[PDB]
Structure formats: structure tokens, C-alpha cells
Amino acid sequence: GKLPVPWPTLVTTLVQCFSRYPDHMKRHDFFKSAMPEGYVQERTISFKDDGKYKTRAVVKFEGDTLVNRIELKGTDFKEDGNILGHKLEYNFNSDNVYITADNGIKANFTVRHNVEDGSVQLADHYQQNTPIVLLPDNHYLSTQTVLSKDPNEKRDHMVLLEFVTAAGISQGEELFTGVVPILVELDGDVNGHKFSVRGEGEGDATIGKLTLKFIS
């Protein structure tokens, strides 16, 4: 009927090729350099004092559409914890995603999810991307996200708006010169509860903008 986990816990899993890289940093944009063939993005997301997600995503162009197709496996979540207990607030904080080269890339960052009781649930992210390219110097992605709802959507859903810019110190980049349609498909299992998510929207790497609507 609906998602077995809170929507905010899925936000990071549900396309960093849409980050805006400053022109002073274009030599360091792995994600676009891998297009159109794309990259595999794999994470381990450790929810401290709770379970973890292991994800594997294929991110690539299929014709004119940037596709993000995901398998997610969630294990060891506590029935009464913040996640399966649905105690997370429906919002998101800013993050810095720290990137370094993998001689692809690796990235690390810790998401802070706000709990109903003012406390904080940490989601520690370990990330690796391998091409299906530009190996970058150390840098990070400054990420901003807002979560909302569609007034006339009847299905369990999440509207997401995101802005991402690289900071802190190759022909594929040409595929991102305009607004690019996005398709996201997630096949999930958390503690044995199988679920799927489908999302559509568009990305505009000129401004680093993402706008998507996901339904479960």
C-alpha cells in the first residue's frame, strides 16, 4: 500500500551528474565524463544504532533520458527504531558530499535526519562510482533539498527539489547543456518488505537543479 520506510531515508539513493561544476572545476566532473554509457553507483548507508541500506544503481543515458535504476537491500532495522518506526521528520538538511578519486570515485558524507523528538538520526554514507573519464582532485558537492507533496496526487508520493554545486579546492558533459528528462526506478527490500519506487522529472546541470516526483 505504501512505503515501509520513511521517504527521507530514500532521498540520497533516488543522479549526481546534474551537479553544477564551476568552470574552474570542469576538469573534475567524473559523473558527466562517464556519459552516455554511465556509471554504477554503489552505497552502504549505515543508520547509526539501526539497520543499513546496501544499494547498487545504474546511472546512464537511454536515448534522451537520464535513467537511475536501483536495487536496494535494507537489513537489521529495529522494529521500534527511528526508521521502521516512522519517527523521521519530512524535511532535509544541507549536506556536503566529499569526493576523492578511486584509482572512478569514492564519496563519504553523513546525513542527519531529524527525529520527531528533536534528536537526530545519522545516516553515514559510503559511496563508490565506477564507469560503465575524468578522475578528480579532492572536492565536495554542496547539496540542498526540499521535500514536498503534490496536492492532486492520490498515491503515496514525494516531490523533491534539489540544488547541487561542486566546490572546495569529458565529452559526456555536452549531453547536459539543456534540460534533461529523468527516470528513476527503485526495486527495494527492507527487512523482507518488498517495495518499488518510480520517479520522473528533469535535471538542469547549468544551475544544478533537480525536480522529481516519486511514487511508491
From Swiss-Prot:
Changing residue 164 to R: In Azurite; shifts the excitation and emission spectra to shorter wavelengths and increases quantum yields compared to BFP. Changing residue 143 to H/W/F: Results in significantly red-shifted excitation and emission maxima. The gene is GFP. Green fluorescent protein has been engineered to produce a vast number of variously colored mutants, fusion proteins, and biosensors. Further generation of mutants led to more stable proteins (at 37 degrees Celsius for example) with brighter fluorescence and longer fluorescence lifetimes. Changing residue 119 to G: In GFPA; leads to enhanced fluorescence at 37 degrees Celsius. In Venus; leads to yellow fluorescence, improved maturation and reduced environmental sensitivity. It comes from Aequorea victoria (Water jellyfish). Changing residue 102 to V: In EBFP2.0; shifts the excitation and emission spectra to shorter wavelengths and increases quantum yields compared to BFP. Contains a chromophore consisting of modified amino acid residues. Maturation of the chromophore requires nothing other than molecular oxygen. Energy-transfer acceptor. Its role is to transduce the blue chemiluminescence of the protein aequorin into green fluorescent light by energy transfer. Fluoresces in vivo upon receiving energy from the Ca(2+)-activated photoprotein aequorin. This is Green fluorescent protein. Changing residue 16 to H: In P4; leads to no detectable fluorescence. In mut2.2; shifts fluorescence lifetime from 3.03 to 1.94 ns. In mut3.3; shifts fluorescence lifetime from 3.03 to 1.88 ns. Keywords: Chromophore, Luminescence, Photoprotein. Changing residue 15 to L: In EYFP; leads to yellow fluorescence, folds faster and more efficiently at 37 degrees Celsius and has superior solubility and brightness. InterPro entries: GFP, GFP-related, Green_fluorescent_prot. Disulfide bonds: none annotated. Belongs to the GFP family. It holds the Pfam family GFP. Changing residue 50 to E: In mut1.27; shifts fluorescence lifetime from 3.03 to 2.85 ns. The keyword Nucleus does not apply. Changing residue 120 to A: In mut2.1; shifts fluorescence lifetime from 3.03 to 2.50 ns. Changing residue 16 to M: In Citrinine; leads to excitation and emission peaks of 516 and 529 nm, respectively. Photocytes. Changing residue 93 to I: In ECFP; leads to cyan fluorescence, folds faster and more efficiently at 37 degrees Celsius and has superior solubility and brightness.
